[PDB]
């Protein structure tokens, strides 16, 4: 295969086996000050997402041009503020491309800062998300310019490694995960053709029926007082994997404190009053009118069996009106996916590091979930 752009980047080649650990190129001690040249008639713009009108341009750009062409992500403004303004976010890392004459938003890419644990190293990186080019500008080499410009802007802040994911295979995946789906409203999914029959319709609704209330004693929504223990449980739980975030307590609050229609977190508080487990999933609908999906986030278990935790996750999602519950085969999720009646999806998710050469890993050692 020929990768015009990626062959010029500090990433391992596809097919080269990696047995080393470390950067591909050194930290840069002088950085291009000038933005990379866009095609004529387009210009860079850093998007102030605290401007409601500018945020509305971005979700319009994303809702209409982002990821069989039946279902498109329907990102909401409030979800985007959550994904794009975690602790340490920078406005110049909300990199947008506008038509010069009309100022219409036609491309975007974002970086947010994360401390990343990869094997035996902890490194300050960025996470790259929401790379989007208007359908009209496609195959005009604008995506590589966006990648180069966000790289430049991240170098300016002294950061030289990134993590990112993609559905397509690029040089070179550190890990490969697969999406799985758990029908919660089987009628609706079959109607809008997201799932198909295998077996009567009546048999299917019984097959997927869930309890009306969770079975775990002491389950309840996360509260402000749970922020420390949630942070402690997560940090300890993540040590067993090989690619994980290292979150501060403020980061834990941002990513797990519940926000309606964005992020749900439930903790298990036992008969002694100690929080010993939590489950979490985010909300991301897709346009078809709409398909309400929940996405498995981070699920930590120390006293409740993981199979019971996720069973409760499905139940709460069902109760909250979601149509489907999605989850990757990473961390220990393979231990519950089949038993809890998930079906395997058709889309992969490849995980990548920029400027870090290291052996690849099984899905089960990936302990990092992005939005
Ligand atoms: C230290 C800091 C480092 C920070 C930077 C780290 C790197 C960040 C990398 C980005 C992380 C984003 C992660 C998530 O957000 S992935 C989200 C992906 N976005 C979508 O799927 C939304 C719908 N698609 C689009 O909006 C466009 O089709 C996109 C923008 C995807 C491509 O636009 P376009 O269709 O008009 O193509 P082109 O003619 O301009 O250019 C083609 C070149 O671009 C390479 N390409 C195509 N798709 C992707 C992709 N998803 N990741 C990386 N590279 C990609 C491709 O291999 C080819 O290079 P090469 O094959 O010749 O080598
Ligand atoms: N990704 C879901 C839906 C696929 C719909 C057809 N592209 C499963 O697999
Ligand atoms: N969800 C798809 C998956 C196809 C095969 C994916 N490995 C189906 O069962 O129709
Ligand atoms: N990447 C997703 C696209 C659709 C999002 C909603 N399931 C799959 O494939
Ligand atoms: N395979 C894919 O399309 C991956 C994408 N993140 C969806 O979900
Ligand atoms: O097809 C296949 C899986 C089944 C649910 C949606 N995607």
Numbering used by the authors: 115 to 181, 185 to 315, 318 to 407, 414 to 496
Task: Give the text the authors published on this PDB structure.
Glycylpeptide N-tetradecanoyltransferase 1, commonly known as N-myristoyltransferases (NMTs, EC 2.3.1.97), are universally conserved eukaryotic enzymes responsible for a major post-translational modification (PTM), myristoylation (MYR).
The product complexes with peptides X and Y (HsNMT1:CoA:MyrX chain A and HsNMT1:CoA:MyrY chain B) fully overlapped, indicating that the state was independent of peptide composition. Of note, in chain A of the NMT complex with peptide Y, both tetrahedral intermediate and products of the reaction (CoA and MyrY) were observed, exhibiting occupancies of 0.3 and 0.7, respectively. In the HsNMT1:TI-Y crystal structure, the tetrahedral intermediate results from nucleophilic attack by the Gly2 amine on the MyrCoA thioester. Comparison of HsNMT1:MyrCoA:X and HsNMT1:TI-Y reveals that the Gly2 amino-terminal group undergoes a 70° rotation around the Cα-C bond on forming the tetrahedral intermediate, leaving a space filled by a new water molecule (wat3). Wat3 likely arises from the water channel as it extends the network. Wat3 stabilises the TI complex through a new H-bond network with the Ile245 carbonyl and Thr282 amide groups. Thr282 appears to play a pivotal role as a catalyst platform by inducing both concerted rotation and nucleophilic attack by the deprotonated Gly2 amine. Tight packing of the Gly2 Cα against the Tyr180 hydroxyl, Asn246 carbonyl and MyrCoA thioester carbonyl groups in the TI structure prevents accommodation of an Ala side chain, thereby contributing to specificity for Gly. To address these uncertainties, we examined our structures to assess the effects of peptide binding and product formation on the Ab-loop conformation.
